[PDB]
């Protein structure tokens, strides 16, 4: 028994130009959601081992975002 410490999906890499993760997404990038609770990761940095999930997306003025946090912390 304990408490959940929920900070939000705040570990983000962002750029004006397309890096290695974005280049290899294989799809149409999603748009940035409005609600922080609906975000879900959509591929991996190490896609062989399936470690390190990320959420890749694009905004309407041309920035690219890679959110690389998927866990949240439990204090007990």
Partner RNA sequence: UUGAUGUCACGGAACCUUUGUUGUCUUCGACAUGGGUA
Residues making contact with RNA (CB under 7 A):
7, 10-12, 49, 51-53, 68-71
User: CB-wise, 10 or 34, nearer to RNA?
Assistant: 10
User: CB-wise, 22 or 67, nearer to RNA?
Assistant: 67
CA separation for the pair 51, 55 (Å, rounded)? 13
Q: How far is CA 55 from CA 11, 12, 17, 29, 30, in A?
A: 11, 9, 17, 10, 9
Q: Report which DSSP code applies to 37.
A: G
User: CB-wise, 21 or 70, nearer to RNA?
Assistant: 70
Provide the minimum distance between the beta carbon of 59 and RNA in the complex, in angstroms, as a whole number: 17
């Amino acid at each position: 028994e304990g408490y959940l410490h929920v900070v939000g999906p705040s570990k983000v890499e962002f750029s004006d130009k397309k890096g290695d993760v974005i280049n290899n997404f294989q799809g149409t990038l999603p748009s940035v959601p409005n609600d922080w609770k609906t975000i879900r990761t959509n591929d991996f940095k190490n896609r062989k081992r399936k470690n390190e999930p990320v959420f890749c997306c694009e905004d309407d003025k041309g920035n690219y975002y890679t959110m690389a946090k998927y866990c949240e912390t439990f204090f007990f």
